[model samples]
Target: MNFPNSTNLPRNPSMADYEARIFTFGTWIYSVNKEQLARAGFYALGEGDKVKCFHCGGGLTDWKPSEDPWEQHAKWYPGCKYLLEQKGQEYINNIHLTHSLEECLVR
Candidate 1:
């Protein structure tokens, strides 16, 4: 299995602008908040629920109910530097710990 790690350099530098990221989700009707996703450095891929991070190019889709944008971003792309920049390591780690507990409970 690949280890999660942080890295520099954005995958979509042109979409790095927060406004640009926001614009991609125009008229979004998904349960997931567009503003929150944009704030989390994700841009709509214009197909289904698919979205890609402007910084890491990490993709996530098929969002379920009650999914928090920041939490999902951290859960799937912990190595994202943009995430680290916005949410400190402690916050990220806390999200992971919380998810671990939830996963255990689900099991």
Candidate 2:
């Protein structure tokens, strides 16, 4: 549930200030709202093989990102600000965690 700490990651020389870290990877499992899943354009592809976005479904086979790795997958997807901002926490406890570090890249 926690973002990957910089100390645990390898240092990047290209962007000396840039560091690669991960919050979640493909193999880990974490809970998330069904809405967040939808916003990320992720749909269960059946048999736990993958989840895909209804819009940009190309990433279903491998849902990963190369930059701002801790930003959360749903944030990059369209129309996910509500989830990103945790807008409805008072009315609905929608917080969830993905125990994977999808990917990382320097700032």
Task: Identify the leading candidate in terms of TM-score.
Answer: 1
> Model 2, range 1-107, lDDT digits (tens) per residue?
22221232222222221111121123335344333444433445443435433333323344344322223433333233333343343322222222222232322
* Per-residue error (Å), model 1, residue 11: 0.8
lDDT by residue (1-107, candidate 1, tens digit) is 23333578787889999899988888988889898899999999999889988888888899887998899999999889999999999999999999889899897
lDDT of each: 0.88, 0.33
For residue 74, what is the lDDT in candidate 2? 38
Worst 10 residues of 2 by lDDT: 15-24
Which pairs clash (backbone N, Cα, C closer than 3 Å) in model 1? none
